[PDB]
Amino acid sequence: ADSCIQFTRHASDVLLNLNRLRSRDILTDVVIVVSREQFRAHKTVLMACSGLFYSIFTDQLKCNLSVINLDPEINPEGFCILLDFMYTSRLNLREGNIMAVMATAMYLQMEHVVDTCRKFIKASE
Amino acid sequence: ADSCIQFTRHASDVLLNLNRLRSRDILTDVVIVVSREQFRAHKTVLMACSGLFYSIFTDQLKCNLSVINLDPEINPEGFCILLDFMYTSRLNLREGNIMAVMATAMYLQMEHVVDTCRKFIKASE
Amino acid sequence: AWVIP
Amino acid sequence: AWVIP
Numbered sequence: 001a002d003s004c005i006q007f008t009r010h011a012s013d014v015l016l017n018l019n020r021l022r023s024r025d026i027l028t029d030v031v032i033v034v035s036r037e038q039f040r041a042h043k044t045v046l047m048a049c050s051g052l053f054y055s056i057f058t059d060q061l062k063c064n065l066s067v068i069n070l071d072p073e074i075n076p077e078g079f080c081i082l083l084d085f086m087y088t089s090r091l092n093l094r095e096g097n098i099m100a101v102m103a104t105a106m107y108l109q110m111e112h113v114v115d116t117c118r119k120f121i122k123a124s125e
Numbered sequence: 126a127d128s129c130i131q132f133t134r135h136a137s138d139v140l141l142n143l144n145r146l147r148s149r150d151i152l153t154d155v156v157i158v159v160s161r162e163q164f165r166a167h168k169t170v171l172m173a174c175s176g177l178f179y180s181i182f183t184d185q186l187k188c189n190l191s192v193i194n195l196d197p198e199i200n201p202e203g204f205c206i207l208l209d210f211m212y213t214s215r216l217n218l219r220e221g222n223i224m225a226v227m228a229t230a231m232y233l234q235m236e237h238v239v240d241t242c243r244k245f246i247k248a249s250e
Numbered sequence: 251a252w253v254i255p
Numbered sequence: 256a257w258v259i260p
């Protein structure tokens with residue numbers, strides 16, 4: 001119906017609770033391996049945030065894997081920063097990590113993050 | 126870090142994608158049965174939105190169930206309206222369904238929905 | 251909170 | 256969109 005009311009804070013409150021489930025390792029169903037660093041997460045949140053994970057977990061064979069190994073060129077810190085962004089909307093972008101975060105966001109197909117990284121780099125050059 | 130930037134639309138975009146996964150029945154992991162009406166959903170979204178589901182899916186035995194039966198007094202339409210609200214932040218509250226939606230939200234332990242229902246009922250009396 | 255979207 | 260939260 002077009003007669004619905006809307007709860008402004010609902011989507012952010014849902015994300016806060018999904019992040020609390022992640023911190024407590026509740027119903028996490030995949031481990032992402034980045035250069036021997038392991039990150040536990042929920043497949044649905046990864047798919048909702050990343051074109052790469054959406055492609056992986058909609059594949060009829062890969063949807064059933066409990067471990068996914070990323071390309072060895074991917075920086076674990078860059079991945080960690082992006083995983084935290086997926087679950088909080090907060091991106092910890094710093095001079096010392098921006099190149100790695102942008103390269104990781106390009107690999108993960110996180111369009112808005114790539115765009116902001118490009119703008120912050122352009123401003124410094 | 127306290128130096129993070131934030132993406133205003135991120136949480137709502139994540140919820141839009143989780144709802145698209147639900148519509149397409151992608152990685153849904155539980156069926157909620159309400160008076161013989163079946164609703165497929167993601168346990169993590171139900172837990173993030175409802176005190177009742179948070180209690181059910183953190184229980185060491187119930188966390189593994191693929192089917193959950195609700196109390197026979199629960200109205201399927203009321204449940205459907207609340208499940209749609211969980212995934213969209215939009216509540217289809219109408220004169221003809223408000224009593225059922227409020228009773229269902231009380232059972233599901235969805236505090237903000239109960240509060241708004243109470244206010245809309247008080248305004249009509 | 252609520253609003254008319 | 257981005258903002259300072």
Ligand SMILES: CC[C@@H](O)Cn1c(=O)n(C)c2ccc(Nc3ccnc(Cl)c3C#N)cc21
Pocket residue numbers: 044047048049050051052054109110111112135138139142143145146
């Ligand atoms: C949260 C912001 C969002 O834009 C993140 N993102 C991005 O940049 N690309 C390129 C994405 C591609 C696919 C998805 N995921 C989905 C896209 C469409 N339909 C579904 Cl069901 C899902 C799920 N899950 C998310 C992406």
Ligand SMILES: CC[C@@H](O)Cn1c(=O)n(C)c2ccc(Nc3ccnc(Cl)c3C#N)cc21
Pocket residue numbers: 010013014017018020021169172173174175176177179234235236237
């Ligand atoms: C989205 C808005 C939220 O307020 C909905 N809601 C509500 O009214 N009650 C009473 C709730 C109780 C528990 C939860 N769920 C959690 C609460 C705390 N920690 C965690 Cl990890 C989760 C998860 N999942 C959600 C509830």
